[PDB]
Amino acid sequence: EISYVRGDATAPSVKGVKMIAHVCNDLGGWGKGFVLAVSRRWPQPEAAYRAWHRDRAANDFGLGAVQFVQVEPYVWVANMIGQHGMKPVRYEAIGTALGRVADRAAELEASVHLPRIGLAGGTWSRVEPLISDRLTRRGIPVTVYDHG
Ligand code: NA
Ligand code: NA
């Protein structure tokens, strides 16, 4: 059962392996919103993402791909390529990425921690059902965080 909490998703307070999953764009932009909250806590995810994008001519970077970045002994950030362009979230891309998060979280026995991007609007009304279908359906604990 998805938990809804007000908090900073970069600091989950639960036991066991934690995975913080969030939506990135496919253009290499890391400059507004939750990506800044991540860089306020750890430098690794941003460095990883920029390198991943820079080297896309030799690697898996693209819509629906996910990069897992270890930031603490039992904490990982999952940079999901889910958004096409910048100021537009792609349903197939987010679905695929969340499934990949689910695969990795299942093997790590991790819980998953996501910032909220409500169910009455275009974005979250696509995303939350894919959380249910790709994560909850597999028995993976999920917590969704509200913060500015
Ligand atoms: Na919430
Ligand atoms: Na709230």
Topology overview:
Elements: E1 3-6, E2 18-25, H1 34-39, H2 44-54, E3 66-72, E4 75-83, H3 91-108, E5 111-115, H4 122-134, E6 142-146
Parallel strand pairs: 1-6, 2-4, 2-5, 5-6
Antiparallel strand pairs: 3-4
Helix pairs in contact: 3-4
The structure holds sodium ion (2 copies).
Relevant terms:
binds sodium ion, alpha/beta, 148 residues, Leucine Aminopeptidase, subunit E, domain 1, six-stranded mixed beta sheet, 32% helix, globular
Can you describe this structure?
Helix 4 (122-134) links the parallel strand 5 (111-115) and strand 6 (142-146). Helix 3 (91-108) packs parallel to helix 4 (122-134). The chain has one domain (1-148): Leucine Aminopeptidase, subunit E, domain 1 (3-Layer(aba) Sandwich). It is 32% helix and 26% strand. It is built from four helices and six strands, in the order E-E-H-H-E-E-H-E-H-E. The radius of gyration is 14 Å and the shape is globular. The longest helix has 18 residues, at 91-108. Strands 1-6-5-2-4-3 form a six-stranded mixed β-sheet, sandwiched between helices. It binds sodium ion (2 copies). One sodium ion binds at residues 6, 146. One sodium ion binds at residues 4-5, 116, 144-146. The PDB classes it as hydrolase. Keywords: Macrodomain protein, hydrolase. The assembly is monomeric.
